[PDB]
Enzyme design. Structure first.
Site, mmCIF file in Angstrom:
data_model
loop_
_atom_site.group_PDB
_atom_site.id
_atom_site.type_symbol
_atom_site.label_atom_id
_atom_site.label_comp_id
_atom_site.label_asym_id
_atom_site.label_seq_id
_atom_site.Cartn_x
_atom_site.Cartn_y
_atom_site.Cartn_z
ATOM 1 C CB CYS A 27 -0.967 -0.095 1.198
ATOM 2 S SG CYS A 27 -1.780 1.439 1.766
ATOM 3 C CB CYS B 20 0.214 2.033 3.952
ATOM 4 S SG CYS B 20 -1.423 1.350 3.791
#
Length: 108
Positions: free
Chosen positions: A32, A35
């Site tokens: 991600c 993230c």
């Protein structure tokens, strides 16, 4: 290497649900990109908010059990816990300034 608590499914109760005070939990995964973009920002907050807040990270692939309990549906999601209860929710990447404002506002 621990300002940030690195959580598991098994340690989530002790680390978060039974902590006395505010915990900032980051639900994330390695694939991600947002993230990963926020990860450095979380390091700065951990330092800055020391003694007001603890930052913790649950990696939702390594630890698949916890995120469904909080209805997590996309990452990154930041859940602010106060003494075991969720006070505030933030979904998606945000800047340091935006995170500061989300924290300052929900910590009172």
């Amino acid at each position: 290497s621990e300002k940030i608590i690195h959580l598991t499914d098994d340690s989530f109760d002790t680390d978060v649900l039974k902590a006395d005070g505010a915990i900032l939990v980051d639900f994330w995964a390695e694939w991600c990109g947002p993230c990963k973009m926020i990860a450095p920002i979380l390091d700065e907050i951990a330092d800055e908010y020391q003694g007001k807040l603890t930052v913790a990270k649950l990696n939702i692939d390594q630890n698949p059990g916890t995120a469904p309990k909080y209805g997590i549906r996309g990452i990154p999601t930041l859940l602010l816990f106060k003494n075991g209860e969720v006070a505030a929710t933030k979904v998606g990447a945000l800047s340091k300034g935006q995170l500061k404002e989300f924290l300052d506002a929900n910590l009172a």
